Amino acid sequence: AGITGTWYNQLGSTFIVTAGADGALTGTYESAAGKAESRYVLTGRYDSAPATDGSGTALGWTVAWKNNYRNAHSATTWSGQYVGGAEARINTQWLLTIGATEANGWASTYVGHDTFTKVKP
Amino acid sequence: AGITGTWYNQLGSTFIVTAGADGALTGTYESAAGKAESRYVLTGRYDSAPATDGSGTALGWTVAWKNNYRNAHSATTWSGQYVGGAEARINTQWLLTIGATEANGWASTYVGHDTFTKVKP
Amino acid sequence: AGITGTWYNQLGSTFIVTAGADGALTGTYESAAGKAESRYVLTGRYDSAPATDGSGTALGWTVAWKNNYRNAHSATTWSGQYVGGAEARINTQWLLTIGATEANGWASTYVGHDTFTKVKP
Amino acid sequence: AGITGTWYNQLGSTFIVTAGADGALTGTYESAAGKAESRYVLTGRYDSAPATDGSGTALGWTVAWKNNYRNAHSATTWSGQYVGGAEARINTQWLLTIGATEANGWASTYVGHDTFTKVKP
Ligand SMILES: O=C(CCCC[C@@H]1SC[C@@H]2NC(=O)N[C@@H]21)NC1CCN(c2ccncc2)CC1
Ligand SMILES: O=C(CCCC[C@@H]1SC[C@@H]2NC(=O)N[C@@H]21)NC1CCN(c2ccncc2)CC1
Ligand SMILES: O=C(CCCC[C@@H]1SC[C@@H]2NC(=O)N[C@@H]21)NC1CCN(c2ccncc2)CC1
Ligand SMILES: O=C(CCCC[C@@H]1SC[C@@H]2NC(=O)N[C@@H]21)NC1CCN(c2ccncc2)CC1
């Protein structure tokens, strides 16, 4: 399965995840960047029976940036895939939406890309 | 608060969601487009304590496109926000990642936008 | 060809464009939103020999948000297609990048979607 | 200022650009991936008076994937910024829109990211 573990992206954020037999992803996310501190709940989904032709395993997950310590009124989803093997890796693109008035909605979404590996920064 | 229930986007897809007290989103997604049939599990997160300044409620969710009937080796995340009121809507952008070889990774992610309302278009 | 004309998006921004025989787009953009005033130079490209099977005409263009009156140190590209016929329309997605330090680069790009029609708001 | 010249991204594609005094980007793009062969015209814009606070220079450009050899009925825009220095780079995100019927419009746009450097990877 390969996905369960502790991953780090290029910003030094820490992605602690468990890939369940039902296709669920469950864990915590700690962002090294932004209006965020300590750990946040995450939940997502992954293809629990991927192709065997060398394709990666599609997955995605969501963090809402509220925990017991602060609330940044925003949420990020990551969409990507797990690529196993030599140096396993989760390649993602992400969308970060901030709570906004409908008038400011046009400016409410950031886009980016994160690459995760199991190598502690 | 007004999130739980059945929503429809401009493609006629059906988003059935429950917003739990812990910030969790759970439900089913039925896509009227693409390599999809019947319902798929979704899970996500939402800001359970949004701003009281008229801002929307930030949220997101993931569908992996595998159910008991078929497996499209892909996953979509929607990132967006709930805006309550007379014409309640959930405005989203989404990323759909397909399982891909490293060679084809550059072409592995689609982007789009879905507007969900309480009434079918 | 259909693209040459004055278009307006859902924000009330005004897109004045000329589609040239070489595949070039040339014109001005006036944004009804953001750190912008009056007109900005735009340049882009379009498929000058599109499919005849009912597909739209792929195109894109760029505005850097500097003119004689102000400079917002940012640029937007729109990628989309012209759909001719009953009510002609240009459907786009866009990416707005703000000048940033490499440390703040993660937060430097907004994503959105604009739909243009020739109907004055 | 340091923008003009030849750049390469992680796919081995070759970006040849001239930054003119009027904010214009002009050049050629040779893609090492996808339905592309040989050079394609590009045109774009860049901030010709960027911030003096260490921020990058915002920019963007478009390629329509038609040249004298072939027509892929599609176009890519790259939105990003030039960051000068010892390891100069142009960091971009991109949107690739394909010509599509209204029916298939939802699936008509790919998203990705390209990092351009002065040295081939
Ligand atoms: O910073 C966060 C939450 C932390 C996000 C961390 C991001 S997730 C993708 C990337 N990968 C990581 O590992 N980390 C980063 N939320 C802000 C966004 C900007 N905000 C506003 C408010 C008002 N106007 C404009 C902007 C306020 C809330
Ligand atoms: O169609 C789906 C899953 C259903 C997606 C429905 C999408 S979710 C965002 C939007 N909002 C909706 O309500 N519905 C649509 N997955 C395909 C994608 C394209 N695929 C390939 C494979 C190989 N090469 C190229 C493309 C194979 C798998
Ligand atoms: O607002 C503009 C330029 C006008 C953009 C208009 C946008 S183009 C897509 C959409 N379609 C339209 O028709 N109109 C809008 N640029 C800002 C962005 C936010 N900026 C910062 C600075 C520092 N930190 C965070 C954010 C400063 C520069
Ligand atoms: O491949 C290209 C044009 C070359 C794109 C190269 C891309 S630009 C961003 C990235 N950075 C690079 O340096 N190179 C790549 N266009 C295809 C796209 C997929 N197409 C369809 C058609 C019908 N159904 C589904 C898909 C047909 C046309």
Numbering used by the authors:
A (entry chain A), B (entry chain B), C (entry chain A), D (entry chain B): 15 to 135
The authors write:
As protein host, we chose streptavidin, as it can be easily crystallized and thereby supports the design process. There are several examples using streptavidin as the host for these cofactors, since its natural ligand biotin binds strongly (K d∼10−15 M) and is easy to modify with catalysts at the carboxylic acid group. No enzyme is known to naturally catalyze the Baylis‐Hillman reaction, a very versatile and atom‐economic C−C bond forming reaction for the production of various functionalized compounds and intermediates of active pharmaceutical ingredients (APIs).
The protein host around the cofactor was rationally designed on the basis of high‐resolution crystal structures obtained after each variation of the amino acid sequence.
